[PDB]
Design an enzyme around this catalytic site. Sequence first.
Site, PDB file in Angstrom:
ATOM      1  N   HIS A  46       0.832  -1.170   0.000  1.00  0.00           N
ATOM      2  CA  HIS A  46       0.000   0.000   0.000  1.00  0.00           C
ATOM      3  C   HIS A  46       0.869   1.221   0.000  1.00  0.00           C
ATOM      4  CE1 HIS A  46      -3.275   2.848   1.428  1.00  0.00           C
ATOM      5  NE2 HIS A  46      -3.895   2.166   0.512  1.00  0.00           N
ATOM      6  N   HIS A  48       1.297   5.084  -1.420  1.00  0.00           N
ATOM      7  CA  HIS A  48       0.456   6.278  -1.555  1.00  0.00           C
ATOM      8  C   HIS A  48       1.320   7.536  -1.586  1.00  0.00           C
ATOM      9  CE1 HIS A  48      -0.417   5.897   3.174  1.00  0.00           C
ATOM     10  NE2 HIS A  48       0.832   6.109   2.910  1.00  0.00           N
ATOM     11  N   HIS A  63      -0.638  10.079   4.416  1.00  0.00           N
ATOM     12  CA  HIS A  63      -1.420  10.657   3.330  1.00  0.00           C
ATOM     13  C   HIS A  63      -2.193   9.575   2.622  1.00  0.00           C
ATOM     14  CE1 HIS A  63      -2.445  12.429  -0.610  1.00  0.00           C
ATOM     15  NE2 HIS A  63      -2.484  13.557   0.056  1.00  0.00           N
ATOM     16  N   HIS A  71      -9.731   2.765  -1.136  1.00  0.00           N
ATOM     17  CA  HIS A  71      -8.950   2.698   0.055  1.00  0.00           C
ATOM     18  C   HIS A  71      -7.557   2.081  -0.255  1.00  0.00           C
ATOM     19  CE1 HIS A  71      -9.802   2.894   4.625  1.00  0.00           C
ATOM     20  NE2 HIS A  71      -8.517   3.050   4.433  1.00  0.00           N
ATOM     21  N   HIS A  80      -5.083   1.733  -8.070  1.00  0.00           N
ATOM     22  CA  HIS A  80      -4.231   1.601  -6.932  1.00  0.00           C
ATOM     23  C   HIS A  80      -3.004   2.434  -7.200  1.00  0.00           C
ATOM     24  CE1 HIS A  80      -2.682  -1.451  -3.675  1.00  0.00           C
ATOM     25  NE2 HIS A  80      -1.695  -0.624  -3.873  1.00  0.00           N
ATOM     26  N   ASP A  83       2.030   0.636  -5.598  1.00  0.00           N
ATOM     27  CA  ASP A  83       2.290  -0.687  -6.139  1.00  0.00           C
ATOM     28  C   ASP A  83       1.244  -1.634  -5.610  1.00  0.00           C
ATOM     29  OD1 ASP A  83       4.950   0.148  -7.277  1.00  0.00           O
ATOM     30  OD2 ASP A  83       5.339   0.362  -5.143  1.00  0.00           O
ATOM     31  N   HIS A 120       7.524  -2.538   3.310  1.00  0.00           N
ATOM     32  CA  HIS A 120       8.662  -3.056   4.085  1.00  0.00           C
ATOM     33  C   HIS A 120       8.316  -4.498   4.284  1.00  0.00           C
ATOM     34  CE1 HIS A 120      12.005  -2.885   7.090  1.00  0.00           C
ATOM     35  NE2 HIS A 120      11.252  -3.602   7.874  1.00  0.00           N
ATOM     36  N   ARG A 143      10.019   5.429   5.936  1.00  0.00           N
ATOM     37  CA  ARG A 143      11.387   5.236   5.633  1.00  0.00           C
ATOM     38  C   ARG A 143      11.780   3.795   5.803  1.00  0.00           C
ATOM     39  NH1 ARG A 143      12.414   8.779  10.879  1.00  0.00           N
ATOM     40  NH2 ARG A 143      12.740   7.177  12.487  1.00  0.00           N
TER      41      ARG A 143
HETATM   42 CU   LIG Z   1       2.168   1.199   2.970  1.00  0.00          CU
END
Ligand SMILES: [Cu+2]
Length: 153
Positions: A46, A48, A63, A71, A80, A83, A120, A143
């Site tokens: 997810h 964004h 954000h 969503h 989307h 990715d 991650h 990060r």
């Molecule tokens: Cu995410």
Amino acid sequence: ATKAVAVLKGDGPVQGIINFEQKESNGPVKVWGSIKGLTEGLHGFHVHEFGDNTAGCTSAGPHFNPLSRKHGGPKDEERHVGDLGNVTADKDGVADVSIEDSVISLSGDHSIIGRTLVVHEKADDLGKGGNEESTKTGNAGSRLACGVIGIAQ
Ligand SMILES: [Cu+2]
């Protein structure tokens, strides 16, 4: 449009190459990405963004990008704007790409190239996020694994 390259660099070594071919003509994006990471799982992709810094995305934190799947569901529904896939890293940090039938998913609603991915080896859930606000935004470790993603051709 036809290919994309993702480049992530973090505090922990996270590296992967996600390539997605989408077009506004509507069609499942053929996308492939492998991730190498620290020992953890991973659930949901997810992203964004609207571009920040390939070493860590500040904008990508809290954000929400509603254009995604409204969503940001992993299979996509609209675009989307991040990715789209589901990846699950093993303890050696290795995530195989779940390629989902997407519609117009180029990673980014304001643009694609420059937009920094927030994923991650972690559940980076879409609509559930984590806690109420992260549920809203759809989890982001700004990060934890971030880099400029974009259609590179
Ligand atoms: Cu995410």
